[PDB]
Structure 1
C-alpha cells in the first residue's frame, strides 16, 4: 500500500561493521595480545596477493622478432643502485635508525618536484631498513603504503588502516575511533611500532584537513610509538593549513628534494647501462637479433657527447630524470626504426646513435605543431585573425565584439577590390558562382571555422545569446599571429 517517495536499488551497501574493537573485550584486563594473534598484523593478505596471478596468462608464440635497442631501453627504464643521492640517505636512515632505537614518536616532512627520486630514494632507504629488520636485532615493525590518490574518499585511510592492521571492516567513524582507542588507551609492551608515509597531500585534504589534522593529532603521544612521514611539493602546508601554533608545537623536521646536476644525471643513466655499454654482440643475418657474450660479431655504442648535451639541456630547467630517460629511449627508437627502414625486413660492424638524433628526440618535445598547423589551414581563419589584429591596431582594445570584427572584415575586403587573390576567391563564397541562389549576410564556413578555433582553444567566447554583441577574445598573441599572417604571399602585401 505505501509508496517510497524515491528509490535507491543500484546501491551497493558494503558489509562493514559499526562496533569498534573498544566493545568486544569490555575491560582493560579483558584484552588479549595482538602480537599473539593470527589475524592481526596481516598474515592473510598474501593469499589475495596470489589469488589473481593466473587470470591473464597465455603461451602464444609465433615468429618472435627481437632487435638491438630494446634491451637497452629496459636497461634504462625506471623500474630498478644509485650513489647520486646518498647524503640524504646517510641522514634520514640515521634519523630513522636512531628513532627506532629511541622508540619515540618522531615525525618528518619532505617535498620535491616530480622527478627528484623522492619516491625512489625513500623506497630504497626503507628497503635497506627492511634488511635492517633482517638483522633481527632491531624491533620488528611494519610498513604502510598510503596512496590517497589510489584511494577515493580520503577518510578511507582509517578504513584500509584497520582492514590491513586487523583485516577488520568498518566505516571511518568507527575505525579511526577504535584506532585512537588502539593508540593512546593501549600501552607499549605489546603494541607494535608501525611506519607510515603519506603521498602527495596537495589533493588529499582539500576541504579542511580534518583528516590530516586527526593524523597529526595522533602523532603526539609518549605511550604510543609510530614513524610518520609525508610527501608534497609545496612547503608552507604544515603551517598553511594548520596555522602556526600546531605546526610549531609539534616541532617536526622539514626537507625537499631538488633538481639534480647534469653530471649526476649522466652518471646514473649510464649506471643503468654499464651492463650494456660499448658491448659487442653476435648477430644473426635475417632477424638482426642482438645476442651477447650465418652470424656476425659486431659492436654497439651510443653518442657520449650526446649524453652530455642531452643531460645538459634538461638539467637546467627542472632536473627530471624521467624526462632525461624518455629522451634517451625515444632517440634510440628513431635510430632503430630508421635502421630497420634501411633493409626492410617485414613483419610476421658498428652500430651507434648520434648527437644529431639524440637532439632530434630531445627537441621536438619543445617544437610545437600549432604553428605549422595554423600556417597550413585554409585562408579564412588567417584572414579573420588578421582582421582582429587590424582592429587591435586601430584601437588597442585587447578585445572585440562579433559585429565590430565582422565590420572590420567586410571593410578589409571591399577596400581590396584590387588584389588578385581576393579577386579570384570573390563570387564562390556567398552564393557560389551560380544563380537560383539568394545572398546571405555572412559567408559560408564562418560558423564552422569559428567553432573550429574554439575547439582549438585560441578563441574565447563568453556566454550570451545575441549573435552580434557577444564579446570575443583571442588567446595567444598578435606577434605569432603575424608569424602566420605574412607567410601568405597575398597577406603580407595587404
Structure 2
C-alpha cells in the first residue's frame, strides 16, 4: 500500500537482476568465460568470500546471459542438495540427461567422462557451496577438479565457497600441476559506499527513495560495513527499520534515532541470581577456575543458609544452572556424572553485575568470603 510497505517489500533480500556493487567482478568473470570460449580450452575457477557478499548473485546473473546461452551449456548444482558427497555425479547426470546403465556411482562417473570426451558444446559447471564436498580422502573433489585436465574435455567449472584457503588447504595436490589448479577470485566484503549504492538502487527501483534520508543510510552502512560487510544484514536492518516504524507510527522519513535504536539493540529468578553471585564469588576468590557443579552447589547452600532463605536440592540446582546456560552467561562442559559437570563463565563480571541489576545483593554475596 503506502511507501512503508513498498520499501519493506522492495528491500526484499531475494534474487535480483541489477548488481551495482559487483561490476569489476562481473567484468572479470565475463572475461574469463569469454577467453576460455574463444580459446576453446578448459579452465577451472574457484570463487570465494564471506557470506552475503554476492557470489551466487553474480553467477546466477551470468548463467542467464543470452550469449552464453548460445555458446555454452550452463549447469548449476547446489552441493548441499545432494544426498551424499559421492552422489553428486548422479545429480550431474540428471542435469545433462545422460543415459547411464545405472545404480552405481562408478558408472555415473564413466558416463560423465564419456560425455566430456565428445561434448559438442562447452560446459559451465557451477558447484555452489563446494565446502560440503570436502571429506577426508576427498576422492570426489579431486575427481571433479581433474576434469579440466582430462584429454579433450571442454568443461570449465566454477566452485563457490566461503573459505579463502579451501583450495590450497583442501587441495594441496593440485598445486603440483599448474594446468590443474583453479584460478582464484575473492569477493571482498562490501564497503560503506557500496552498501549505500545498493540501498539507493533498491529504493529507486520502486521510487521509495524519500523514506530514507542519506544521513541515516550513511549511519546504517557505516555500522554494517564495519561489523561484517554482508548485504543481507544491511537489507535486514533496512527492512526492520521500516517494519518497526510502521508498528510505531501506527510521509515521515525515518530519523537517525530509529536506526540508532535498532542498531544499538542488534549490535532474573532469585535462585539464578544466587547461583550467578556464588559463581562470581568463587571465580574471584580462587585462582583455580575448574568449578564443578557440586563444588558450586556446596557454596551456594552455605550462601542461602546465611541469607536465611531455602536452598534448592542438587537435582533442581542442575536445572537452574541449565536455564542460566541458555542465556549465554555460562557454558557447561559435560562429564560422566551430573556432579562432575564443569561450569565455565562466559561473561565478564562487569557485565554480570549490570545484568543482575541487584547491587545491594551482589555487594553482600561478594563480601561473604567466610561462606566459601
Distance verdict in 2 for CA 1:179–1:122, change over 3 Å: closer
Deviations 1:374-433 (A, max 9, x none): xxx12212112212222223321112234433332344355x4xxxxx35xx4xx36xxx
Question: Is contact 2:8–2:239 with CA below 8 Å preserved after alignment?
Answer: yes
Q: Which residue of 1 aligns with 2:354?
A: 483
Secondary structure in 1 matching 2:189: coil
Secondary structure in 2 matching 1:106: coil
Q: Does 1:150 align with 2:51?
A: no
Partners of 2:297 and 2:76 in 1: CA distance: 60
Q: 1:387 aligns with which of 278, 303, 310?
A: 278
* Distance apart, 1:86 and its partner CA: 1.3
Q: Which residue of 2 aligns with 1:335?
A: 245
Q: Does 1:87 align with 2:59?
A: no
Secondary structure in 1 matching 2:74: coil
TM-score (structure 1 length as normaliser): 0.66
Partners of 2:334 and 2:314 in 1: CA distance: 22
* Distance apart, 1:309 and its partner CA: 0.2
Question: Is contact 1:453–1:459 with CA below 8 Å preserved after alignment?
Answer: no
Q: Where do 5+ consecutive residues of structure 2 fail to align?
A: 366-372
Deviations 1:69-97 (A, max 9, x none): 22222222233223332122222211211
Distance verdict in 2 for CA 1:72–1:442, change over 3 Å: closer
Distance verdict in 2 for CA 1:352–1:242, change over 3 Å: closer
Deviations 1:186-212 (A, max 9, x none): 3xxx63211111112222222321011
Q: 2:131 aligns with which of 170, 195, 202?
A: 202
Deviations 1:275-307 (A, max 9, x none): 44467xxxxxxxxxxxxxxxxxxxx53232110
* Distance apart, 1:475 and its partner CA: 3.3
Partners of 1:337 and 1:365 in 2: CA distance: 18
Partners of 1:132 and 1:390 in 2: CA distance: 70
Q: Does 1:192 align with 2:132?
A: no
Secondary structure in 2 matching 1:143: strand
Q: Does 1:363 align with 2:264?
A: yes
Q: Which residue of 1 aligns with 2:109?
A: 176
Distance verdict in 2 for CA 1:247–1:146, change over 3 Å: farther
Partners of 2:334 and 2:91 in 1: CA distance: 46
Secondary structure in 1 matching 2:291: coil
Q: Where do 5+ consecutive residues of structure 1 fail to align?
A: 1-65, 280-299, 341-349, 367-376, 417-421, 431-440
Normalized per residue, which structure has more helix?
Answer: 2
Question: Is contact 1:486–1:492 with CA below 8 Å preserved after alignment?
Answer: no
Question: Is contact 1:68–1:336 with CA below 8 Å preserved after alignment?
Answer: no
Partners of 1:491 and 1:337 in 2: CA distance: 38
Partners of 2:146 and 2:301 in 1: CA distance: 69
Secondary structure in 1 matching 2:137: coil
Distance verdict in 2 for CA 1:74–1:471, change over 3 Å: closer
Q: Which residue of 1 aligns with 2:201?
A: 271
Secondary structure in 1 matching 2:292: coil
Q: Which has the higher contact order (CA 8 A, sep 6+)?
A: 2
Secondary structure in 2 matching 1:114: coil
Partners of 1:180 and 1:142 in 2: CA distance: 16
Secondary structure in 1 matching 2:47: strand
Q: 1:326 aligns with which of 226, 229, 236?
A: 236
Q: Which residue of 2 aligns with 1:233?
A: 162
Secondary structure in 2 matching 1:145: strand
* Distance apart, 1:444 and its partner CA: 9.2
Partners of 1:152 and 1:444 in 2: CA distance: 42
